[PDB]
Write an enzyme that holds these catalytic residues in place. Structure first.
Site, PDB file in Angstrom:
ATOM      1  CG  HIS A  12      -1.924  -1.229   1.176  1.00 28.66           C
ATOM      2  ND1 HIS A  12      -2.916  -1.394   0.204  1.00 28.66           N
ATOM      3  CD2 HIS A  12      -1.978  -2.337   1.973  1.00 28.66           C
ATOM      4  CE1 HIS A  12      -3.565  -2.560   0.423  1.00 28.66           C
ATOM      5  NE2 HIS A  12      -3.021  -3.145   1.496  1.00 28.66           N
ATOM      6  CE  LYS A  41      -4.064  -7.733  -2.681  1.00 32.67           C
ATOM      7  NZ  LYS A  41      -4.424  -6.445  -2.091  1.00 32.67           N
ATOM      8  CG  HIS A 119      -6.875  -5.366   6.758  1.00 37.71           C
ATOM      9  ND1 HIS A 119      -7.231  -5.778   5.482  1.00 37.71           N
ATOM     10  CD2 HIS A 119      -8.027  -5.023   7.412  1.00 37.71           C
ATOM     11  CE1 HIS A 119      -8.560  -5.644   5.396  1.00 37.71           C
ATOM     12  NE2 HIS A 119      -9.082  -5.173   6.544  1.00 37.71           N
ATOM     13  CG  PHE A 120      -6.317   0.037   2.601  1.00 33.82           C
ATOM     14  CD1 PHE A 120      -7.540   0.097   1.930  1.00 33.82           C
ATOM     15  CD2 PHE A 120      -5.644   1.238   2.839  1.00 33.82           C
ATOM     16  CE1 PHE A 120      -8.065   1.317   1.494  1.00 33.82           C
ATOM     17  CE2 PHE A 120      -6.150   2.476   2.431  1.00 33.82           C
ATOM     18  CZ  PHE A 120      -7.371   2.500   1.753  1.00 33.82           C
ATOM     19  CG  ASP A 121     -11.955  -2.290   6.952  1.00 31.74           C
ATOM     20  OD1 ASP A 121     -11.772  -3.560   6.769  1.00 31.74           O
ATOM     21  OD2 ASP A 121     -13.019  -1.843   7.346  1.00 31.74           O
TER      22      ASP A 121
HETATM   23 CL   LIG Z   1      -6.881  -2.535  -0.894  1.00 36.00          CL
HETATM   24 CL   LIG Z   2      -4.555  -5.490   3.227  1.00 33.18          CL
END
Ligand SMILES: [Cl-]
Ligand SMILES: [Cl-]
Length: 124
Positions: A12, A41, A119-121
């Site tokens: 990210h 992905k 984590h990216f929510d």
């Molecule tokens: Cl994402």
């Molecule tokens: Cl993630």
């Protein structure tokens, strides 16, 4: 194996650019960050801010995560981000992505010692 903190960084962060300038930005970054290795992905978001500013979100507004967990935090201000998603014409071996630049608040899950993003929510 890669640690959870290092995996977040790799998938990210893009502090070298202020924003995506081309419709080709996602095809190039997904490849260079090794996200099209095993499979394409499907969805991924990049944040164009310093690492220190993203880590600081772990001490901002506490909210629930989509899954119900309560270790999510929303940024007080908006940040420069780029959304990357596969198009109808994408295939294994030939990944293709649509690039969408925007300015929004980010939501991340934090854990550990030091307490950092894992984590990216979502974005709002
Ligand atoms: Cl994402
Ligand atoms: Cl993630």
């Amino acid at each position: 194996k890669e640690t959870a903190a290092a995996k977040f960084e790799r998938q990210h962060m893009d502090s070298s650019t202020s924003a995506a300038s081309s419709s080709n930005y996602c095809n190039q970054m997904m490849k260079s960050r090794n996200l099209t290795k095993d499979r394409c992905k499907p969805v991924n978001t990049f944040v164009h801010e310093s690492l220190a500013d993203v880590q600081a979100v772990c001490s901002q507004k506490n909210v629930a995560c989509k899954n119900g967990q309560t270790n999510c935090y929303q940024s007080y201000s908006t940040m420069s981000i780029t959304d990357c998603r596969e198009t109808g014409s994408s295939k294994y071996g030939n990944c293709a992505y649509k690039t969408t630049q925007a300015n929004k608040h980010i939501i991340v899950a934090c854990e550990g010692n030091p307490y950092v993003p894992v984590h990216f929510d979502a974005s709002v």
